[PDB]
Amino acid sequence: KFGTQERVNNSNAAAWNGMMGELLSGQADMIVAPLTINNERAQYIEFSKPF
Amino acid sequence: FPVLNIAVILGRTRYITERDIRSLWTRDMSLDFDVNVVTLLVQQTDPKSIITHVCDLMSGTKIHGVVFGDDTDQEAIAQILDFVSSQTFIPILGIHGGSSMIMADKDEMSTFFQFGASIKQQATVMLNIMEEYDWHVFSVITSNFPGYRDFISFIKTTVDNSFVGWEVQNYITLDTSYTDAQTLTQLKKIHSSVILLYCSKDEATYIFEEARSLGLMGYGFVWIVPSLVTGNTDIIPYEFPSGLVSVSYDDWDYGIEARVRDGLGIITTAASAMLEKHSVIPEAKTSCYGQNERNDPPLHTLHNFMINVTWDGKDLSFTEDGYQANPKLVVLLLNMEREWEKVGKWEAKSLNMKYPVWPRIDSDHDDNHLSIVTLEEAPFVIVENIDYLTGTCVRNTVPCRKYFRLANSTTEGTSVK
Amino acid sequence: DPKIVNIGAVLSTKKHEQIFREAVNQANKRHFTRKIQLNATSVTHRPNAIQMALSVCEDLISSQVYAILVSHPPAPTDHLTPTPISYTAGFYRIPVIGLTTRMSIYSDKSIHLSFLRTVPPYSHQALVWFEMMRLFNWNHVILIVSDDHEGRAAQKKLETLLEEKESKADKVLQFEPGTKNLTALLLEAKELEARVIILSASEDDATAVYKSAAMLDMTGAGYVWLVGEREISGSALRYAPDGIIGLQLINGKNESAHISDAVAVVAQAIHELFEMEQITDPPRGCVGNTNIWKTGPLFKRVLMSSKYPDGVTGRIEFNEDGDRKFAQYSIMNLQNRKLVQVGIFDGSYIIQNDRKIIWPGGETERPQGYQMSTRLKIVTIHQEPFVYVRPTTSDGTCREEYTINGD
Amino acid sequence: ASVMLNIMEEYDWYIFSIVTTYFPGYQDFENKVRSTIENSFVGWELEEVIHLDMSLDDIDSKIQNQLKKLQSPVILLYCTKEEATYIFEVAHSVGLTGY
Amino acid sequence: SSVDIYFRRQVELSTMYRHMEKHNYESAAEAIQAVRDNKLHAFIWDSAVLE
Numbered sequence A: 001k002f003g004t005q006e007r008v009n010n011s012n013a014a015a016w017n018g019m020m021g022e023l024l025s026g027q028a029d030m031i032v033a034p035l036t037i038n039n040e041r042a043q044y045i046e047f048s049k050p051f
Numbered sequence B: 001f002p003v004l005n006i007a008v009i010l011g012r013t014r015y016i017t018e019r020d021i022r023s024l025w026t027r028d029m030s031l032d033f034d035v036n037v038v039t040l041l042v043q044q045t046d047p048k049s050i051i052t053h054v055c056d057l058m059s060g061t062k063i064h065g066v067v068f069g070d071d072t073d074q075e076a077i078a079q080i081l082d083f084v085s086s087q088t089f090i091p092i093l094g095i096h097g098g099s100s101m102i103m104a105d106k107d108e109m110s111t112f113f114q115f116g117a118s119i120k121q122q123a124t125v126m127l128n129i130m131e132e133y134d135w136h137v138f139s140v141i142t143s144n145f146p147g148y149r150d151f152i153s154f155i156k157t158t159v160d161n162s163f164v165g166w167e168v169q170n171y172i173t174l175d176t177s178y179t180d181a182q183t184l185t186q187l188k189k190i191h192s193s194v195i196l197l198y199c200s201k202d203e204a205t206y207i208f209e210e211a212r213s214l215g216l217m218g219y220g221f222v223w224i225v226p227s228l229v230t231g232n233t234d235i236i237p238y239e240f241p242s243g244l245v246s247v248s249y250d251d252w253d254y255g256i257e258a259r260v261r262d263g264l265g266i267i268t269t270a271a272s273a274m275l276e277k278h279s280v281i282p283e284a285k286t287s288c289y290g291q292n293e294r295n296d297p298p299l300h301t302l303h304n305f306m307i308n309v310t311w312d313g314k315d316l317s318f319t320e321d322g323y324q325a326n327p328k329l330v331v332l333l334l335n336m337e338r339e340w341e342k343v344g345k346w347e348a349k350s351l352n353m354k355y356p357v358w359p360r361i362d363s364d365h366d367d368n369h370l371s372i373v374t375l376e377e378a379p380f381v382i383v384e385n386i387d388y389l390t391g392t393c394v395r396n397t398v399p400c401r402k403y404f405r406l407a408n409s410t411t412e413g414t415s416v417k
Numbered sequence C: 001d002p003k004i005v006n007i008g009a010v011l012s013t014k015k016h017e018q019i020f021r022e023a024v025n026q027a028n029k030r031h032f033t034r035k036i037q038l039n040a041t042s043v044t045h046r047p048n049a050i051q052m053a054l055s056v057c058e059d060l061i062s063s064q065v066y067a068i069l070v071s072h073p074p075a076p077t078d079h080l081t082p083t084p085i086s087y088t089a090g091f092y093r094i095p096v097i098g099l100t101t102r103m104s105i106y107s108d109k110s111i112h113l114s115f116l117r118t119v120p121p122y123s124h125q126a127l128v129w130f131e132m133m134r135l136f137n138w139n140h141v142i143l144i145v146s147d148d149h150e151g152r153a154a155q156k157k158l159e160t161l162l163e164e165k166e167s168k169a170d171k172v173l174q175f176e177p178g179t180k181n182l183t184a185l186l187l188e189a190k191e192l193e194a195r196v197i198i199l200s201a202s203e204d205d206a207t208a209v210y211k212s213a214a215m216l217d218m219t220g221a222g223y224v225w226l227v228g229e230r231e232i233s234g235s236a237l238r239y240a241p242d243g244i245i246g247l248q249l250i251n252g253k254n255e256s257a258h259i260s261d262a263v264a265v266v267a268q269a270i271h272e273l274f275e276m277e278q279i280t281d282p283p284r285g286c287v288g289n290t291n292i293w294k295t296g297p298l299f300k301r302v303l304m305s306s307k308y309p310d311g312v313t314g315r316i317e318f319n320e321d322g323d324r325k326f327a328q329y330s331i332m333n334l335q336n337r338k339l340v341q342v343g344i345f346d347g348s349y350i351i352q353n354d355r356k357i358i359w360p361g362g363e364t365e366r367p368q369g370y371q372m373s374t375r376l377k378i379v380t381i382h383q384e385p386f387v388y389v390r391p392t393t394s395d396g397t398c399r400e401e402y403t404i405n406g407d
Numbered sequence D: 001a002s003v004m005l006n007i008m009e010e011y012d013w014y015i016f017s018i019v020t021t022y023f024p025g026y027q028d029f030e031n032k033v034r035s036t037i038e039n040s041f042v043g044w045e046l047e048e049v050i051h052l053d054m055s056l057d058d059i060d061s062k063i064q065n066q067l068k069k070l071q072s073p074v075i076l077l078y079c080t081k082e083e084a085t086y087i088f089e090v091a092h093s094v095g096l097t098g099y
Numbered sequence E: 001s002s003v004d005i006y007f008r009r010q011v012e013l014s015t016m017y018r019h020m021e022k023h024n025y026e027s028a029a030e031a032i033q034a035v036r037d038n039k040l041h042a043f044i045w046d047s048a049v050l051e
């Protein structure tokens, strides 16, 4: 999955991960995919004008 | 064979001698493992008395393990003994009262640790009570002692799951340094159902005084009280606006003497798991002089290799606080007449309250909690089971109860969840 | 009426004890003599791990000192030795003032509640870095911290500084102390766009950090280094690099100034204090006591708001944590593999000394920290309309397959 | 009272309480307000009306207990000037004067 | 999937949130297939992928 912020096991606090966390993580500098744009994600990252 | 060296101390205002339980424990102690015991008692607790005495006994004889017993619930004491533990590296634990009472985060070097329980966990216990009857808690305030910052996060962690529909109204700190009033004026602003307390009984004493003036003592402002106050089971400040939940481990449920043998057994099993298993159990050696680093740290001491053990088959697996990871807890309510009536008891994951119905505080007021039953049909209401996987009811639904049928039976019966 | 109000202290040497008593005697003249009497008591800190504290309770608590001063042992040994006293007085609720404890280990006031010191911790050094970052306009940096209360606190402080701005958390890097092999992480670090670096660690660890960093050629121009006082000092310097910014606390080594200054400041806290009523003396005698001292938090409150900006050490004001405010640091440069003062920092504003700036590569000015990355690693998911996945036809990557419109 | 209402309306402070004393015209003040507040379509809220005066030596207790309940943002007060001094000292203690 | 946020935040849909959750898929290929296989009577997703 692209991924969503979720409880990190015992920690219960974690990054959205998947495509996005790799992005926060820096594995992928930029994400090109069919991604819907929403506020929950939006605070964490910049988003381009919706295509 | 091994002939270990151990010491135990009983300090008390309630009558028993260490000798009584000494010989008892050695008898009980006798078959399982070798042990050599020296017992000493001291009447009232002091930083100087305890430090001096423990160093006095330890140095004279090379004891490897001890326990601590008291008839007092003072808060500072634990930290002091813990401090001794950081330097000595000698295992210590305690079975009753203050030593059993929780303490601030343990240092990197292992310390004595039987008293603490994940305060978070403790709060989740309390939350279970809140889940049954508490929603939108009035206040959680980091007023005093350990975890003012720490308690603050968990509430957020609890709220963060967002599995149900949780929320907070009051979220502040403070007490003694200035006019109580900034905190008080802020507190006036909150308007909620259950007050959450994380302050010592001393602070609480004043807080009780604050609440009466504040109006928190009045109906609609339940108090959730931890061991921070609860600890003085014997003594309750009259001004303590009763009926608020005060709850911690109970002496009646578990004997104070009972705790010591088991621990000794655990020590024995630890040694069997360390000593027998290719490890050397070194003596304390140096405690009261110079700064020589105590001839360095013991190599392969292996004090914390086992944190989840059993004794007599009892699952006494321990937490990061060294505390029974199988919290044996009971729920206590401050009664109408200065009494901790047993509100309920906590077993494992499940939360238990002895009375399903919510007690009316004093006389019922303005027809509060009117008992209403709504028949269930396709047209008006509909009933389905609560999400037992979470142990909770659906957010947009209402948690419901009924009486499990027992017409013949004296009991009304419980058809909850 | 004058009642000698005892004071107590633990100091490095008897000479410093004499200095203490001298300052105290100076003290009676400055504050009103009739209202109160000042008397001085101190110890020369013989190195017993758990007995000096014994005597502190036996002598100083038995003497009911209204406050205690403490300094780092003259013998250059141990780390954060003054742990026990903060606990021991803790029952007493007796204010403690450290002269030399700039270490952040005792920052944990949840257990060090009774603890205090005039000097700012290593974490507070970040105040400089933000100001430094502010001037040069690099918003993009990297933070390298050891894993402990010290490093994590530094990170929290700097990030908190950044929180007022849009939070800037790119490339935080945590390593655990005592680790000799650390190169692998730096390979990860090259990847990141930002070219400015800041680090906090111990001297021993720092040797390993620079040792590993030099292997991957991290020090090269276009890279900047910002660091703590500890990093520039000790063994860190010898296998150590060039053109790296550094910090040294002003008057950190010399307690005596801090002794007279702290005492003058404390004097405001106690003398003003007695203007208030419902005061209680600190618990008299270690024995027979389990109760806190109700005045102590108040003494802390006035003492934190004590003012006394004029001082031997510099301006004095205390932040919420009890940590000192606006402490002055002296920026240091590595020119010709030697320490030099390029500038000095005092108050909220940096000051530029006449000395020429040095950077990695020798450029007079090296502001640009955004070289950037030519190639972008892009990520996707398998979604049928906007993405298609086919295996390479044998070795060949793709197919000449054509769209419905001929292309 | 009308002007007080107009002032409140201008700043659109809908929710208010009245603290009054046994001083003359207190009962009518309530009556005039009732009519003025009542006639209007708007759903503004009157939270509390308090009538208090010294009685014995528990006026402070009774007043304090009575005043402590209130939570409203906008307060209309009516009393003698001096009484206003005492009520304000009491409010400063209560924290009612604050922002 | 992002709609899960909608079900999450929409306490109004909690019922549906769980009802939905218990039947979720790792991907569209399986989610479309279930309806095609007739394993699941209905499938919920954003139109651009679905139409």
Ligand SMILES: *[C@@H]1O[C@H](CO)[C@@H](O[C@@H]2O[C@H](CO)[C@@H](O)[C@H](O)[C@H]2NC(C)=O)[C@H](O)[C@H]1NC(C)=O
Pocket (backbone or CB within 6 Å): C004, C006, C039, C040, C041, C042
């Ligand atoms: C004021 O405090 C000083 C220092 O604590 C006291 O000087 C000590 O007096 C004791 C007498 O019991 C001697 O044993 C010490 O040698 C003295 N200096 C120390 C303790 O280093 C002085 O007595 C105190 N003044 C009064 C009036 O009690």
Ligand SMILES: *[C@@H]1O[C@H](CO)[C@@H](O[C@@H]2O[C@H](CO)[C@@H](O)[C@H](O)[C@H]2NC(C)=O)[C@H](O)[C@H]1NC(C)=O
Pocket (backbone or CB within 6 Å): C181, C182, C183, C184
């Ligand atoms: C520290 O450990 C790292 C990781 O094992 C070493 O890096 C490896 O170096 C060898 C060459 O001796 C390469 O073959 C490996 O590919 C490297 N590891 C990785 C991640 O691939 C490193 O050599 C060690 N320290 C040094 C410099 O000796």
Ligand SMILES: *[C@@H]1O[C@H](CO)[C@@H](O[C@@H]2O[C@H](CO)[C@@H](O)[C@H](O)[C@H]2NC(C)=O)[C@H](O)[C@H]1NC(C)=O
Pocket (backbone or CB within 6 Å): C254, C256, C257
């Ligand atoms: C540490 O404090 C001592 C004593 O206050 C300082 O010694 C003084 O140095 C100044 C130099 O301007 C002399 O004028 C004084 O005579 C010295 N003794 C005093 C002030 O009584 C010392 O300078 C301080 N340490 C540093 C590095 O400044």
